[PDB]
Amino acid sequence: AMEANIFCTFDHKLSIADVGKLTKLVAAVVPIPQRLHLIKHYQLGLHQFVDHTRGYVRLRGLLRNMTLTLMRRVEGNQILLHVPTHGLLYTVLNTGPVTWEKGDALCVLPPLFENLLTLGQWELVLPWIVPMPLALEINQRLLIMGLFSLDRSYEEVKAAVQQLQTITFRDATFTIPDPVIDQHLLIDMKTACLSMSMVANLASELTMTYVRKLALEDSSMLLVKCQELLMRLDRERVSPDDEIARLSALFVMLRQLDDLIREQVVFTVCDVSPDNKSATCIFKG
Amino acid sequence: GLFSLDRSYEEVKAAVQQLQTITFRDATFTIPDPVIDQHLLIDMKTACLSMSMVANLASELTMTYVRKLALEDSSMLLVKCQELLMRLPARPQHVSPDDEIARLSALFVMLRQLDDLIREQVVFTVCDVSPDNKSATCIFKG
Amino acid sequence: VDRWIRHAAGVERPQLLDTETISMLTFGSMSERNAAATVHGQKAACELI
Amino acid sequence: RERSAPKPQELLFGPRNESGPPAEQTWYADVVRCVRAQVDLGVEVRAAR
Amino acid sequence: MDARAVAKRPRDPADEDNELVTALKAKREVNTISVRYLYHADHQALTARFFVPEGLVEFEAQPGALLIRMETGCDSPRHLYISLYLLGIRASNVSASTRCLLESVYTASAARAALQWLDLGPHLLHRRLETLGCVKTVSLGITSLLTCVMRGYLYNTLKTEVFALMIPKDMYLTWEETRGRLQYVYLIIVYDYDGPETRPGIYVLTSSIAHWQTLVDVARGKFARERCSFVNRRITRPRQIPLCTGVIQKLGWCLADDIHTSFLVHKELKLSVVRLDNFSVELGDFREFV
Amino acid sequence: RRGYTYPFGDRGKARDHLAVLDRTEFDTDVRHDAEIVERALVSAVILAKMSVRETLVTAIGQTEPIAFVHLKDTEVQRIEENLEGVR
Amino acid sequence: HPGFALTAVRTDTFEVDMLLYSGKSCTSVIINNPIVTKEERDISTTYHV
């Protein structure tokens, strides 16, 4: 009896070298846009989304929605993909740039940097599998690096940017690409930075009005401390429709950041080979 | 809940009238009995605390990004964005990537605290639909 | 004095992090590298009394 | 009170850490009340920070 | 596909003969190895094997110990595997007498190294810890081997005995008078921001609440003083950028009637514990709250 | 304190010069001031040159000359005039 | 000559072949049939005998 699997057919002629290349990846995580029984090879990987005017954060948002699946068997005329289920253990390949340890929690990221299966115009772009603290560090460093975009003229800013790019994890050192290209920032990262700054600016002025009203009632002596902190901050430096608009804008700009703000674990590892390229881990979704 | 504080009673009624109605995905819904009480009060307190901490933590770079961007960019998004703000060459007065990293790290925790009170736990994730919208197949979680 | 003595004896000055110090104190480390070539066996190191 | 900070060796090996003074002290006090003249001499009290 | 194929109920995993028996029957060849029954073939729990030095294995000889992975900040061991009991030393929640007892128990170089590494760095405690699960085996030696489950019940080879989860009594926490029938158990680390340095509190909470927001509201009610301390440090001590007042991690579920009080014996010393008889592990990640 | 936070490309030699700077103090021997000052000044100039990442001397048996970094020329000559007046 | 002498000690390791004698039925061994324990992973399963 078989297990349930998803069939993928390549709409391109394959040489023996190509299929020999595919069977090397017999445990890699392949993202798929929809849970569908039969698919064409164009749907594999991230190549379908690649764009010139968009960058990392939009790819992160799209990867949030895609379905993760593991390549299970390679044959002529077709590929077998297995979609994992919550609570079971599976074998995955360490295609990322960093070695793993037992007990690590892994999360999936768009690739930052050998090429695989260059067909006529399509490439098998697999994502990065990375331990969670490294992903948090990468997200924060990239967001800050985009925040310095307007100040790039000065040498001090350039030195800070170069320091931000170079990141070291266990036994591995690598540099992440600068989200500024041709002295300009892509629209998605621009929206992210603008949202962060807008949330900060709006909160700064909105907070005091409600804090001073609510702290008088406070039975937990904490809101008075918040008021005092705001007063110190201020000393270091309206129609109801406008107030409603500002509150709604604060909350809508808050929602824009949830892709950057939080991330979810997909695998937790408990086995590693000396061959460490592969590991066995349980799936969480 | 937040607007109800210190606002006049009649304009509170008007705001509740305009806010309670929602248009989503080409349909109109209205919230029944939007009472303000202790249950909303605790959420208001946590929101105020989180906003205070966000305002305290945010670096000067974060605050000044929007102001600096408007000097050389121009878009509908930006002009609609800057209408909400209070109306007021150079180099950054202080550059310190380590401080920026730590500050952003704490600010993420505070933003999560603020986000949680409007977030609702996902119970189902759907990938199918009956073309009459009456039924769908979903994955259960939570 | 430390610099002069270390130069005379032919020894490099140690540098270690506190975490590395703790690990070395507890578990030990193989801090001495192998020679370029060995025609004889292991170093039967002599300890002086 | 004035001994130097322990090195990693003594923390890892050998005896326990030398205990400091207890946090709660014993004091004696004289209490003088004015509204009806009354002075209580030599009362024992416990003081903590 | 046909009607009889659809009607056919699925094969019983227990009435089909396994692969090795299939091959031996196919060739009709005998083998010395007993093959008819495969052990652990029907264990639904997921387990892993961990190596740990002799000094660290104490109170984890008995099954049911919670196993944590700690970061050393070094490349030579990189990670160490420690129990909740060892964290009992550092926690302010534990009483003086119990602290003295289980400090006298862990008088080994490896345990002291773990404590020095824990206190050495500038990070908060929870950033240095990763939870693995509960242990149920021991093979003693200069290097000991522990097998730990990370999803499932605790039981031996034939399921002839189910193991409990042991929590030291000072770390046990309840917030309801009458227990709900189903109980979820959480791990809490809470930081007190006094003058010199942060003193962490460590708890294991048993609660009927599964919703995150309600649980965090109850926790914020119970830990008001630490939140006040967090804000006070934020005011008095700028350029110190603290994060979090506490973290909450979910690990497991058990029935209220399974909860009992008991003691543990090691080198004729008695430690008192709370005992979750039919505990099954289900790990989450650390979620932080303010 | 300001040199600690600068994003230097090579933190090692920067930390060495920071150490020699922060160790400096005067021992109230009226004759010892000049050499202490010279040591502090050469370390500080090395740090400033690295920050602007202008080239710096490396020949053995030789040390970085003491001079102002990127200072306005007129202010430089005014400072020289003041120092001559002191002399 | 400095005013002191020193005695050196070193240990050498030789590789040798051992010879063993034991009497008839000097000990009895008690065994059972080998047992198979199954450990399952997605790509491959391992059986412990």
Curated annotation (Swiss-Prot), chain A:
Record-level GO cellular component terms: host cell nucleus; viral capsid
Task of the protein: Structural component of the T=16 icosahedral capsid. The capsid is composed of pentamers and hexamers of major capsid protein/MCP, which are linked together by heterotrimers called triplexes. These triplexes are formed by a single molecule of triplex protein 1/TRX1 and two copies of triplex protein 2/TRX2. Additionally, TRX1 is required for efficient transport of TRX2 to the nucleus, which is the site of capsid assembly.
Domain of life: Viruses
Family annotation (InterPro entries): Herpes_capsid_2 (IPR002690)
Protein's name in the database: Triplex capsid protein 2
Subcellular location: Virion; Host nucleus
Molecular function GO terms recorded: structural molecule activity
Pfam families: Herpes_V23 (PF01802)
Family listed: Belongs to the herpesviridae TRX2 protein family.
Alphabetical UniProt keywords: Capsid protein, Host nucleus, Virion
Subunit structure: Interacts with TRX1 and major capisd protein/MCP.
Swiss-Prot record, chain C:
Coiled-coil residue windows: none
Name of protein: Major capsid protein
Similarity comment: Belongs to the herpesviridae major capsid protein family.
Span within the parent record: 1127 to 1175 of 1370
Subcellular location: Virion; Host nucleus
Assembly: Homomultimer. Makes the hexons and eleven out of twelve pentons. Interacts with triplex proteins 1/TRX1 and 2/TRX2; adjacent capsomers are linked together in groups of three by triplexes, heterotrimeric complexes composed of one molecule of TRX1 and two molecules of TRX2. Interacts with scaffold protein; this interaction allows efficient MCP transport to the host nucleus. Interacts with capsid vertex component 2/CVC2. Interacts with the small capsomere-interacting protein/SCP.
Role summary: Self-assembles to form an icosahedral capsid with a T=16 symmetry, about 200 nm in diameter, and consisting of 150 hexons and 12 pentons (total of 162 capsomers). Hexons form the edges and faces of the capsid and are each composed of six MCP molecules. In contrast, one penton is found at each of the 12 vertices. Eleven of the pentons are MCP pentamers, while the last vertex is occupied by the portal complex.
Top-level taxon of origin: Viruses
Swiss-Prot record, chain D:
Record's subcellular location: Virion; Host nucleus
Source taxon at top rank: Viruses
Region of interest: Disordered: 1-22
Subunit structure: Interacts (via C-terminus) with capsid vertex component 2/CVC2.
Similarity remark: Belongs to the herpesviridae CVC1 protein family.
Function comment: Capsid vertex-specific component that plays a role during viral DNA encapsidation, assuring correct genome cleavage and presumably stabilizing capsids that contain full-length viral genomes.
The protein, known as: Capsid vertex component 1
Parent-protein residues present: 447 to 495 of 594
Curated annotation (Swiss-Prot), chain E:
A GO BP entry: viral capsid assembly
A single MF term (Gene Ontology): DNA binding
Compartment(s) where it occurs, according to its Swiss-Prot or TrEMBL record: Virion; Host nucleus
Top-level taxon in the UniProt lineage: Viruses
UniProt entry keywords in alphabetical sequence: Capsid protein, Host nucleus, Virion
Gene Ontology CC annotations of this record: host cell nucleus; viral capsid
Pfam families xref list: Herpes_VP19C (PF03327)
Primary location class: virion
UniProt function note: Structural component of the T=16 icosahedral capsid. The capsid is composed of pentamers and hexamers of major capsid protein/MCP, which are linked together by heterotrimers called triplexes. These triplexes are formed by a single molecule of triplex protein 1/TRX1 and two copies of triplex protein 2/TRX2. Additionally, TRX1 is required for efficient transport of TRX2 to the nucleus, which is the site of capsid assembly.
Record's subunit section: Interacts with TRX2, MCP and capsid vertex component 2/CVC2.
HAMAP family recorded: HSV_TRX1
Family: Belongs to the herpesviridae TRX1 protein family.
Protein name, per record: Triplex capsid protein 1
Annotated source species: Human cytomegalovirus (strain AD169)
Gene: TRX1
